[PDB]
Write a protein that binds this DNA or RNA. Structure first.
Lengths: 155, 156
DNA sequence: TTTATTATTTTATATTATATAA
DNA sequence: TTATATAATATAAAATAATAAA
DNA sequence: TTTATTATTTTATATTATATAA
DNA sequence: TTATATAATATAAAATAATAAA
């Protein structure tokens, strides 16, 4: 259940740029009217089933075109997505354990090549548990500066 | 997920007058700081219970004082709802079968005094199925004039 | 909750590169 | 990480909500 | 989805006449 | 109809969401 700030982001992200239409769908729009002219008898659900197999069928010249147009459209979206996401309110600084895990995950993975990252996180948890206090405090004190700057920057 | 004209009503309904609080809560808000000072150790939930026990054993002359106040506030709330509900857009006109059910409900219930509203409606639903077509048209024609008038007074 | 009619909403479909859920 | 939702759309047909009274 | 810490959120509780759900 | 939710409050305390990276 999202909290007040995640609702805001979620609501803010929702008004962000939307993913571009599928490459097929661009081809569908062009031959949608023709296709209705091809057949008024069949259901709209039937419409898309027959139309679907047209797309597989198209010669590469026309097909690829659409695909390429989708590539170009997606690229325009992804630029907007990066600039949109950078501008929106920042999440809170990660906690002491997270920063620690982030520093040692690389060595812990090399010492456990078989383990998935979920098991790495379990491992790093017990590593954090066994950490000396003084070492933990370094992460805890470091977090204090983190939210301190975060609170002074964003009061 | 509901019809649009209806959806405007629902958003309007939420702005409507809210029902007043109980008589216990009037008494609680009046004596809340007193209980905590009498019971500084007790948790928030613990003090609510202390207040309830005080409420159960409260002098009845003062206890009725809140009851009567609560009665004053609920009347105000009631008058607000009437005036508020009369001002909001109207509900859709009832279906043909519904008006039939209402007209014939009295008679059907006398035939079956051992039946709940739910059961009686199944009986009345069987009666509508066998109802004459000329009779069924009467309600159906009546309903059409109602929604058509409804749409005129409450256009989308 | 029940009922029947009707006004209104959801679904059914195609495609996939990735954003997102987890 | 892997598994799943999403982006676009037309539109018949299928699903359901509205409605009253107890 | 996993981890620990930390921030945020819900709950624990009294009452009870009616309104609302079903 | 019957069965459950509701209106109000405090605010400690218990619960849970945020938080990265894969």
């Amino acid at each position: 259940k999202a909290s007040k700030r995640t609702q805001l982001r979620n609501e803010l992200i929702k008004q962000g740029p939307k993913r571009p239409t599928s490459a097929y769908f661009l081809y569908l729009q062009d031959h949608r009217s023709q296709f209705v002219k091809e057949n008024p008898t069949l259901r709209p659900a039937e419409i898309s089933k027959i139309a679907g197999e047209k797309w597989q069928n198209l010669e590469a010249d026309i097909k690829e075109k659409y695909i390429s147009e989708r590539k170009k459209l997606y690229s325009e979206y992804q630029k907007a997505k990066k600039e949109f996401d950078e501008k929106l309110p920042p999440k809170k600084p990660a906690g002491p354990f997270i920063k620690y895990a982030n520093e040692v995950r690389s060595q812990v993975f090399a010492q456990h090549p078989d383990k998935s990252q979920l098991d790495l996180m379990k491992i790093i948890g017990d590593k954090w548990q066994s950490l000396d206090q003084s070492i933990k405090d370094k992460y805890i004190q470091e977090y204090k500066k983190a939210i301190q700057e975060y609170n002074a920057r964003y009061p």
